[PDB]
Symmetry: D3
Subunit: 304 residues, 6 copies
């Protein structure tokens, strides 16, 4: 909840940000969105990997051929505007491009244009306030993630989340904090809404995009940070049993940030606490907003 | 376009049927819908297999665990009310159950309730004016339909249509009227938004639900009508080549009704016109609204 | 627990029925077994489908090429002997053919012979004393059953049960009575140790053997009984969603007999009680031992 | 054959190491085991990678949730005791953890404990006397290895060997020394009871664990030794054809050690004798027991 | 070997029927062919299911879009011509449509035409002279048949036989008469060059076309003959183990006719001789050329 | 077209290089071939990677067990002979080993020998004259490439091209210059007759052989050239969406050389012209024939 939402170029009051119930996206899942985070840092409010997220928004729209009238820079300026206009120092930003009030035909008529929305509001830890220090208990779901050439997993589209809803709800229904999904082959894909990382003998390990894992921006940042710390990273297909033999396992995402997993299916993950490597990575990631970790890549975009 | 839309129990004017842009379904494809048709018949306006569609709406919501406060009878009465209220004699009804303005978390908070909408409006033939008499040209898409244990194909949910959008747009981009999708195994599934039927040596043939084909109500009706006409029906897995060797091939759906396919991938389907068996079935189906075909199953529900 | 166990042709006291710890089967799962039931009936103690079970024992041994010195008749006579010698009127018989104390090489040396054991003892309802009247709550497991050309599912071999152990324990760990496994394709296979049956519009439905479902003797009996009752039976591949849309669903097995399933994954199966068709079948099956159902197939083998 | 066998903490005479015929593991393949080797070296009898094998025994039991009361150190001391007690200088040790005399239900009753055994005895080369110097003839089996999410291949459990029995017997029935299995996808997995290695243009090559290949300890040792010799190692999925195009191909295992493969399916592997790289690795491996190869990893555990 | 070959409408002497070495089909497998048999019967030389085979030739060419200038009737007349011209009373006819001397590009240039050839010559029992009375020993091959949507198995094209070459040679290399191939899923497909049939409890059984089994003309005839004899036929997916449990198993094809299989993988198929049902079908099939079996379908086409 | 063709050791005139119409390869696709190029360079006519191509010819024949009487050196000398005899300075060489006039049985009789042919002739740009400078528009085909253990993709055999014919003709039928095929899993395999390369953030990327991609000689050369230019190369499985997100994409082959792809499915590949990295690689490749790029590997074989 906040005061204004950027809607097609205009700052509209949150309560007046309405759309017709016959909007295409409500019926067909025809929307593309992002998850960006604004952090209060040593140099004021800063949007983490702002450009990268807006570029992915365009990429997701490009795969579905959704016409986007706004350039990446326009969207970035609009994003900063929303944060300032609402007087937020830290928040969760949510850009959403959707097919609006067009016909009821699955295929939108030629010459149509999409509606764009950017909402920002403060949001806590996605998996619990105590999830970052003490781990979470995860469960391997009975539902598998989308097959390779069906519904593109590289795109962050609305319709994709019926799957995340099934995987995540099954875990919570049985008392776990999050569910881990396997692909159609029986290999580890990722969590319901976050990438998965293991740690064996001091080595990282993450499933490639071909395991139906979305190319997370946080995932990418962790791989680059790991290389700075001198930790070997391996991007390979992982079996289900590896979760039980791993020394450490954690999840990554914009909302989830870096959450350690202390157990999988009731089987404790070495010690049952946040591990050594996960700790180093957490410190290095959060150190970006304290100044301790030098921003060598230009990941911090000042809101002003 | 029409006058009123049934919205959570109230007949609201079309222009005022708005919902918040932060509605869950807009971001995560969390909606379930139906496609129903009202025909002007020999006994006045009648809704084809009304109860069956309403029962499927409940079944689709049940799989996803979406709470539905309205009973099947309540929805049916509401449906007839929409048609009468708008003075429609024939139309396309569109029931939609969606997760509204709840949090931004993938899993809605316990105790939430869904919003329901029922909109009716006149709609012509889905594949074209001439489509029913002269066939359509179809193309086998390069995109496959959802794998078995990923996103349930038996449910008619919003998020499912990202796939239908990809299959159908590819066909139309290349000059065809509709696209035919194969499942992940390489067998025939169905069209982008309609079931597929073949006709070999006087025998029907349709893919089973396990070929990722949705349990169509029109599909079911055709199978029952064929049995009355003494036509042998076979529900079996079909290979791609079968489309080139079939004497006849047609598609079924609420919007598409019964549309013959005159060619697949530029390869003509026996004669290039509507076939004999397809013709008999079309006459038997439309005969229900003329009185020529006796409604032995009670598929015609009077609007009054 | 009982007094004697038939061991290689001799009635040995239960406590002296020992075998060396270096027996091949203990290390490599190299054993084949059966589950037979003795019922107290209107014509005294009777072994249900005795010959069929012994024939399957030979078939399972034949697939693995295990040498069996005893003929089907010898094993049947030995079986009756064990029941009489222990003064049992009703019991669970357990024939077991295993590779004994041979070398430690995976492949037994040429000219080796197997050890045979037949133990009988009273055993109650496998899924609970109240499981037959009121249903059980089942869960779809995250573990899949064996792929088609890996470890033959038609054979009832020891090593097969590591899978049943994984599927069944996961269900019980989460509060369910039994787990239902899908095959590698994402289709319904069967329960951890029992075949699965659904009931839609008055029609049965069971997965074929090709869905990695073991050719159960109880399953076969139910299909033949159903045909006598005039119920249509369909042996076809079933999707996971079908469990949620079914009017009735039950499990079959020698130990489980005919157990109705009142819910799958927390989703109630029409009414939440034993259904109409399942009831008819239960009455018809148990009626065999009361005389109400005529044994037209010769399924009851008198112990004497 | 030897004098004593460690049985649940006691050194029992070989002849008296018996267990009941109703032991769970005999009927359901519920056991986990290891293969360890004691070599007579330049520093006396030494167990190769002792702790590593004991840790894997615990990992295999962990996946199946089998309760193990003994710690890794306890098992190691017990192992050395068995070797000393039997006056062995070189032998094959066989640790076995199995579900004993509990009920006949697939799932053991809560609070049960497992029986543990450790037997040692001298064993020659698994594939033959000449096998190490002259290669062996291998055949690609018609039976595939277990699919990814069915029965965990990372675990060395009893029931797993029904597959190894099928693959290996087929090869020997046709005149070959060992069989090579493909996974369900058609890629190379491993031999019936040993890992597979190829050698192309001076580069190693081995299938990853995700190809249903067990994480062999010998496999791991070879990878580490190769890196010391400056040989490039590549863990990647290999097609069947690669076996015909490889310059060298060999198998690894505790029992098989390092055995070269001179031909696959009657097609000679470059020269038909042990290759250059295989030779270097064999000399480096056996050099550990001569002192020529320095034990930089601490793989040699003294028995005393 | 014979005197004349029909080549593009001309009766050319066998020795002069040559084609350039740069013919497309020689480098790219771009050919489509048939196998037809002429039998000496009670009504003189007759071509078994002549029209059906010519219709399939056109169908195979249609799938690949090879232009065929000759009508089905022209090809049939040409076939009878070849038989007469060579004074044959019984023979094996071989129609072949191939892409000739066009460019070396994979895709032939627009406006090209195909070359057609029809050769007839006497040919004995495909699987051996004694194969029809005493069975043959078959082996399950380690090579799988083509996946569903790759190279159409419904078409009888030249390039398809690289697979048949691999499956068949592997069997013969090991002492068997024919090889049985499985599909990519691990189910029974068919023999290297003939359809596979099983016989369980008096019931037939054959894999559907979707198991990568070619729609054989002999296969079709046998299904129609069996229905006349009152034998139940089931077209379903078959597991590998079913070959070991079947009472009878035989293969069908134009060249192989109806050949019983007495063993599969060294495992005897009930009695090890031609079974009862196979015998009835053989007598019914060959009875067509003696007059004993009435030709109700018009399968015998007179050569004159 | 040229004057002479090397045929079984003899220089035969082009017009007289004929083979019988009953040649095995014409009916069963039993042939193996290569594609080699001769370039006019700074040191005169030179055959690019001559030995490598002849070695692959032998490898392809070895897989199918086709007897080859000529050694690699004999074939190389014969190749140079053909070029000289025809007075060619630049040409496309085509070695072809095929099963000739043997029986009509799928498996050739023991003791048979193959026929060998080497034809050379000038051939232009495979994908078009302008294709090397301006890119080509490609389409993702609806036909998939051969599954892993069916018809070996590592071999360049005649029968393989029925697949290439289907993939390539579909693209050209819709207005594209070439078709890109996916494997049975839905991952990128390669073009109809050329390997596929992507370029993301300055990094290469190519599918491994296990994605049913033929081990191209040009592909290998490009990987080695890129390593010289200091460009990172990654051999990994690629998803379909990656084609839309790539900065650059190009195809490689002997006939196609190095062809940039400016669009895939109507979606422009960054700028729509030949990219920076592709350009550097093209210049480095063609520089080998100008002397600008030093031949460190000995890829240029002088014709003399
Ligand atoms: C399915 C899925 N996989 C990974 C990620 C993480 O990507 P990234 O944010 O770019 O590092 C997500 C992201 N989920 C978001 C968009 C939604 C929440 C989980 C509600 C987010 O974390 O911002 C994903 O959904
Ligand atoms: C993917 C898909 N498959 C089948 C059917 C036909 O079902 P039915 O109407 O029950 O016979 C459809 C139906 N789609 C509807 C609901 C929506 C249109 C595509 C807009 C319809 O035809 O009314 C389907 O989508
Ligand atoms: C995996 C599996 N599937 C089916 C059946 C039922 O077969 P049947 O007894 O012949 O009708 C079983 C059988 N399990 C037995 C052998 C063991 C118990 C479950 C402990 C049995 O019911 O007797 C099976 O295991
Ligand atoms: C299926 C399988 N795969 C690999 C290995 C080799 O592992 P390792 O000994 O750890 O290098 C094996 C090992 N099998 C043992 C344990 C049993 C024999 C086959 C009897 C062994 O070689 O000692 C395996 O089975
Ligand atoms: C792969 C394959 N499958 C079935 C059949 C049988 O078809 P049909 O003759 O129509 O019953 C065949 C046919 N093979 C022929 C064409 C060639 C011989 C094996 C050499 C034949 O039998 O005539 C097939 O190849
Ligand atoms: C299917 C396929 N894949 C890759 C290549 C490229 O191999 P290479 O020439 O070794 O780099 C080819 C090669 N195709 C040739 C043989 C035929 C033309 C396409 C007509 C060629 O380029 O020379 C291939 O076919």
């Amino acid at each position: 909840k906040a005061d204004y939402i950027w809607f097609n170029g205009e700052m509209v009051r949150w309560e007046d940000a309405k759309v017709h119930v016959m909007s295409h996206a409500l019926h067909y899942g025809t929307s593309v969105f992002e998850g960006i985070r604004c952090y209060d840092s040593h140099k004021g409010p800063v949007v983490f990997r702002h450009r990268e997220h807006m570029q992915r928004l365009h990429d997701s729209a490009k795969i579905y051929r959704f016409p986007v009238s706004q350039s990446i820079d326009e969207l970035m300026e609009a994003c900063r505007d929303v944060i300032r206009k609402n007087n937020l120092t830290s928040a969760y930003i949510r850009p959403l491009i959707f097919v609006g009030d067009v016909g009821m035909g699955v295929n939108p008529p030629a010459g149509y244009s999409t509606d764009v929305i950017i909402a920002a509001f403060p949001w806590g830890a996605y998996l619990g306030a105590e999830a970052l220090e003490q781990g979470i208990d995860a469960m391997v779901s009975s539902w598998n993630r989308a097959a390779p050439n069906t519904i593109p997993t590289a795109a962050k589209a609305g319709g994709n989340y019926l799957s995340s809803l099934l995987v995540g709800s099954e875990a919570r229904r049985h008392g776990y904090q999050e569910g881990i999904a396997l692909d159609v082959n029986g290999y580890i894909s990722e969590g319901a809404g976050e990438n998965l990382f293991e740690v064996k003998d001091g080595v990282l390990f993450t499933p490639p995009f071909t395991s139906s894992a979305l190319p997370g921006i946080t995932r990418d940042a962790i791989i680059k940070l790991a290389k700075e710390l001198g930790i070997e990273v391996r991007e390979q297909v992982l079996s289900r049993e590896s979760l039980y033999l791993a020394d450490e396992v954690f999840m990554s995402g914009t909302a989830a940030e870096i959450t350690p997993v202390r157990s999988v299916d009731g089987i404790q993950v070495g010690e049952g606490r946040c591990g050594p490597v996960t700790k180093r990575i957490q410190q290095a990631f959060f150190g970006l907003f304290t100044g301790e970790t030098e921003d060598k890549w230009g990941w911090l975009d000042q809101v002003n």
